[PDB]
Design a protein around this ligand. Sequence first.
Ligand SMILES: NC(=O)c1ccc[n+]([C@@H]2O[C@H](COP(=O)([O-])OP(=O)([O-])OC[C@H]3O[C@@H](n4cnc5c(N)[nH+]cnc54)[C@H](O)[C@@H]3O)[C@@H](O)[C@H]2O)c1
Ligand SMILES: NC(=O)c1ccc[n+]([C@@H]2O[C@H](COP(=O)([O-])OP(=O)([O-])OC[C@H]3O[C@@H](n4cnc5c(N)[nH+]cnc54)[C@H](O)[C@@H]3O)[C@@H](O)[C@H]2O)c1
Ligand SMILES: OCc1c(F)c(F)c(F)c(F)c1F
Ligand SMILES: OCc1c(F)c(F)c(F)c(F)c1F
Ligand SMILES: [Zn+2]
Ligand SMILES: [Zn+2]
Ligand SMILES: [Zn+2]
Ligand SMILES: [Zn+2]
Lengths: 374, 374
Amino acid sequence: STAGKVIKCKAAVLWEEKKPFSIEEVEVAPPKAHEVRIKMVATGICRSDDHVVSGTLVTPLPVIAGHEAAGIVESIGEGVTTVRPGDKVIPLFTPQCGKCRVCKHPEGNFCLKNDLSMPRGTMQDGTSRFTCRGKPIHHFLGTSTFSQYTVVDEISVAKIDAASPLEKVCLIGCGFSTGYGSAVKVAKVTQGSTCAVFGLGGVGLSVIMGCKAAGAARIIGVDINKDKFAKAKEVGATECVNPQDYKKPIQEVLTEMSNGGVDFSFEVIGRLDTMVTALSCCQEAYGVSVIVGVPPDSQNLSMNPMLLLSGRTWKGAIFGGFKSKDSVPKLVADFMAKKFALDPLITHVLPFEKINEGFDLLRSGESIRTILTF
Amino acid sequence: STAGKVIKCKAAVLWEEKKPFSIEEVEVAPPKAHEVRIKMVATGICRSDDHVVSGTLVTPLPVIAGHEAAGIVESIGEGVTTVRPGDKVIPLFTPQCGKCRVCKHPEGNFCLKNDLSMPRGTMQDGTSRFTCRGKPIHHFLGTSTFSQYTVVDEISVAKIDAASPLEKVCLIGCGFSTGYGSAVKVAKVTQGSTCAVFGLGGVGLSVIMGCKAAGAARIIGVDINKDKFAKAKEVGATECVNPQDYKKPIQEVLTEMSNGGVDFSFEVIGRLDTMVTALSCCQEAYGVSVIVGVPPDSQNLSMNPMLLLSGRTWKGAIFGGFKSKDSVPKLVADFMAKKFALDPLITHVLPFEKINEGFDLLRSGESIRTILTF
Ligand SMILES: NC(=O)c1ccc[n+]([C@@H]2O[C@H](COP(=O)([O-])OP(=O)([O-])OC[C@H]3O[C@@H](n4cnc5c(N)[nH+]cnc54)[C@H](O)[C@@H]3O)[C@@H](O)[C@H]2O)c1
Ligand SMILES: NC(=O)c1ccc[n+]([C@@H]2O[C@H](COP(=O)([O-])OP(=O)([O-])OC[C@H]3O[C@@H](n4cnc5c(N)[nH+]cnc54)[C@H](O)[C@@H]3O)[C@@H](O)[C@H]2O)c1
Ligand SMILES: OCc1c(F)c(F)c(F)c(F)c1F
Ligand SMILES: OCc1c(F)c(F)c(F)c(F)c1F
Ligand SMILES: [Zn+2]
Ligand SMILES: [Zn+2]
Ligand SMILES: [Zn+2]
Ligand SMILES: [Zn+2]
């Protein structure tokens, strides 16, 4: 029995940038008031986790990363009302406190209790529940899913369907919901429209899924890796283009292809240049461009504001614009009701012990999502 | 008495950047097919006309500027169906061809026949109707309202109420409609919201009018010229701030004043720095910022796309997002029915012959709108 006790378990600790994860024993404290300790079942490898490794994202180290996952509640702290031991849950890397101005806003999801903007790498109370070799280890986004057990704040966990297949619905914790919501909720893609999707990884494929669900007539996938095009077409891309195949800049190609610009474009890579290209390729008077990718820390882009003055809309979003705790259970219910598919995003399924191999598959271009199983 | 004949009249010709206008005789050719020759009655001095003088806005010289005006049709060319001789009209600097993909789109207004994006300084047929000293003179935005007579394409003119006071409703041809629409149509300001308006000239005052019409609870005016604040409060500002009064950047001041960022911000100046400041000061998860000011030619801004990733929406618009030929007559009808006021924008009246004094009044900071009478 582990309730109220320190757990010694296995986790993937990142001690410093640009090094492999170290799979080793950590101590996980029991949950405090309004905290939940979760036995992990499955976690996806998102590019954002690789950004911590590469230094693209700055967050305090050493750290237990991982933010796309699903597991089963092991124990709850005093005052928890929304989950119980044995519940299937998804950790929420964007929390939903329910009390801040953003949570109360009909269109806000970026709760002010997040640990993204200005990361502390702690629980809400400014402390850590992790130690390794006698040293405190930072949390990541309130989730830290690269561990057999984590502790999260109640506002960072959602109860989901008890019959959920956790090795699939873990993707609702980041990449599926992000891409699908970027299309259906943030962009509000319209029936009959033309979309361009820059980056055909797990998140970009989810954007395609959402564009097709919304009834887009044309969905143009853009990637420098042509090995990504077959799966993009399977999930709804009508065309794919590789910028490297063209003498012209791709914004010009896409403007030509769309007879004057696309209705909706999405940056799903994380490069400053592709953010500006994606904006430019949407029709100048009524186009919408959504930034989804995460670019290198503290770098500014350059752009001509005439692109906006003519009438373009430029926006971005975290987690597809979804209010996390309200939406995650509904998305799992919709998956259970066959309203969308997750299998097209899953290319590899590895034990957790092969986390490094899973990151090498992402870096080499081979994988979409690797699911690690505990 | 002049139908089919060249008209000799006075115009304000700009031969060179950074020089006074030259009031002198020009020849105005009769209208060709689908053209309309207009006897001007009143024209406003908009900062965009001053941009042509300063080189902020690049358009071919020599030129007859002016784009905010009203007049009476003198004659129509073959095939014109939408106006007749003797009709009161407003020239439309943003055309409405009614046929292009933008005109057909429910939210588009930046018609593809515009002469703004890549100015030619011609009629739609690529030629000029103006001669001065035997030399061809450029048009400006298809309107060229700084002339006793102009010729415009039919898609660039709207028939308005025959009982219209032309010395007021000229402002519907640019500054009022731009600012009002930027609030009510482009931003879609909501009841109870907090707005910030950067720049309190005729366009920013019109933005305030729209934010007040929309029910905003707080409207914060921002200007470095504190002489602008009294009128801004008369038309709806709840409070005004001068960035020069503060040690901290005004985006930080405005974020503090709004307990975490404003719902809606407007850049109504034309500076790259205030475009980024205005974006920054809107709430990071659900704020909306609208660029209205005209940026300096060919210059890029620098900004961190994390401002957008958190959830902000950034857009711009020409002419308040209004489809010009549909909207201008309705706006005049609404003015006739006292649905909005134009007098708060008019600070000075001068004869056309005193156009240079009118530009001096704008450059000194004294005026909002000077209305020139022919
Ligand atoms: N906004 C959010 O809430 C959120 C959520 C999840 C992921 N992300 C970010 O979204 C991005 C995509 O994540 P992912 O799908 O896991 O990554 P991924 O699986 O690495 O996919 C990226 C794709 O971009 C392609 N690519 C790389 N460079 C270019 C280029 N120059 N032109 C066109 N294609 C290019 C690359 O070949 C790959 O297929 C990353 O920056 C993530 O950090 C953001
Ligand atoms: N998008 C459109 O369709 C459209 C239409 C009309 C006007 N414009 C542009 O809108 C802008 C405003 O035009 P307008 O109202 O006629 O001009 P204006 O009367 O010159 O007003 C501009 C205001 O900005 C103030 N200002 C200048 N610098 C700063 C600063 N650093 N911070 C704060 N305030 C400052 C200035 O004191 C003045 O009151 C100009 O750039 C026009 O070219 C655009
Ligand atoms: O993939 C989701 C994701 C983000 F969108 C971020 F902006 C971020 F900083 C991060 F750490 C993250 F995991
Ligand atoms: O004031 C309206 C106005 C604009 F918004 C422009 F973008 C522009 F180029 C121009 F010439 C103009 F007059
Ligand atoms: Zn909250
Ligand atoms: Zn992610
Ligand atoms: Zn048109
Ligand atoms: Zn103007």
